[PDB]
Design a protein around this ligand. Sequence first.
Ligand SMILES: Cc1ccc(-n2nc(C(C)(C)C)cc2NC(=O)NCCN2CCN(C(=O)Nc3cc(C(C)(C)C)nn3-c3ccc(C)cc3)CC2)cc1
Lengths: 267, 330
Amino acid sequence: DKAMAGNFWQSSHYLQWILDKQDLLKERQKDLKFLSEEEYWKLQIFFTNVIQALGEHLKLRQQVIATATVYFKRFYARYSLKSIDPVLMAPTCVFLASKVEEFGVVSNTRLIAAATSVLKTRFSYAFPKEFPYRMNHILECEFYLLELMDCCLIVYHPYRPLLQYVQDMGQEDMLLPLAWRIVNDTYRTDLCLLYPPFMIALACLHVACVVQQKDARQWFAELSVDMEKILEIIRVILKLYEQWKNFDERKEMATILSKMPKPKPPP
Amino acid sequence: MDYDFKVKLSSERERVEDLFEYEGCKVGRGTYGHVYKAKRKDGKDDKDYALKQIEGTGISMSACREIALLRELKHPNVISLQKVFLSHADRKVWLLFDYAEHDLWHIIKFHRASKVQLPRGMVKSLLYQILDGIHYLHANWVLHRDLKPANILVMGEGPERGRVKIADMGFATFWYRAPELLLGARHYTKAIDIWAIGCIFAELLTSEPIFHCRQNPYHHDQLDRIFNVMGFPADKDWEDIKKMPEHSTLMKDFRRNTYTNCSLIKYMEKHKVKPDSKAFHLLQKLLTMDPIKRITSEQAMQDPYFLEDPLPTSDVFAGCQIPYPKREFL
Ligand SMILES: Cc1ccc(-n2nc(C(C)(C)C)cc2NC(=O)NCCN2CCN(C(=O)Nc3cc(C(C)(C)C)nn3-c3ccc(C)cc3)CC2)cc1
């Protein structure tokens, strides 16, 4: 079994990186002068998709991609989108995450080629120019990222508790594929910054049960958990699917990216 | 990258050379990098710290693993990361730790040179704190992988006087290597750490490395020495020895007959440790050849050895004068 597996309640994740929603929303006002709330949410979905695509291209397991995604979220939870180009930060997060999760140092050539090829082939609707950054830019950005995060590298995710919950139900084949994808979908929201992962797992499992019309009311009643919190998470999940429906990333993202505030250069 | 953001962070960024005095205070150099005995310049603390400049530049796998892990771990018997500095100009990574004045390598060598063996209360206390620290790492699925006297630190004068701090140089002398590794086992295990702890305990009891040996996973002479001490394992003692990749090499090179008069009992008797003692019975449970027959760290902590007079103490030196020398500057 993996390092620090049972240590969530004593972890840096829990003790420093579960944030107050109001503190998060206060720090977001900087960027809300330039972007609407809807546009800011659309941007965070877009960059979640960029990180997923980068990870897929590099052949990284979902857990490395999830950690990279949390790192990215934590950076812009504190700082403006103008502080460091998120086109640079995204591959930096994947690069750092890959070292933390013990899949290695992605080579200079392969990281840059991956950033270049993904933007060009999967995201040309957003980006007219080729990826302009080189490895020295990634290495500088990695130092800034590690500092913001207060060197908090080990991250907990809902996949493990989810797997344990469905095994207990005896419903792994029926429910796991759907619940697993719903956990992927939660990373296009702020949920990972606001709730413990096990709580996010239970919410995704509940929505999987409702979609597939499985009665799990008895099993959920028998858990020792704050069910008002679980219902808040479910509401966020249901709202994310209505946003998904109404959002055409491909039509809108070029304009939204142009409205984004951009780095001021030296005098 | 935004200019205002950059200058602001640069202005507020704590630098190691501004906060700490470590010029000419180097206390170790190795493959890990460099370690200095540091004191705060802005004199609020007035307390000694170990300051490690990590070998290389940037966020190497080594720097990343040490930071990731030590950032999370919190136990009185594990060395504690206090602060991390990223030096932007040269890309050097610095780590600030507890300063432990002593360690088991110097402590054992001091006693081995004096010819005063280790006091029995001190030995028990050392072993208990080591076990307590390893039990914490093992419960978090952190294997040490290089337990030996040099990596058992002991705090000097101050508020943690005589407390063990487990550390690591990051190696990842085969004297503390379990026989399964010597016979080509592919994976590190909790059992491998327990063997090494058994080896340290014997060394604390006698002042001599139990599997001492002159300086490819297979090493013949190290196995020879282990069998000289332990005897050659019977089929019944270690049933899966046949599944080790080097098992046939072992059979080619060694004959059971060569070690018929050899046993841990006989070895320890020669070094005036009684085989009737609770100390020996614990030692024998740690130094079991078959890894699945070694006790766990928790079970070792529960042994009646630690209920016997004298009881383990938090300060391993039990309030007595520390005779051991302080670290010399290089
Ligand atoms: C790549 C990597 C490296 C280390 C680690 N872990 N892992 C651990 C666990 C126990 C939690 C598993 C701990 C540490 N780090 C650590 O203890 N670092 C603290 C400082 N370092 C500095 C260098 N160092 C030594 O110099 N040890 C040592 C050996 C010796 C002799 C001469 C006896 C062979 N002296 N010293 C020594 C010198 C000076 C001081 C202050 C302390 C010890 C190891 C301790 C992880 C990843």
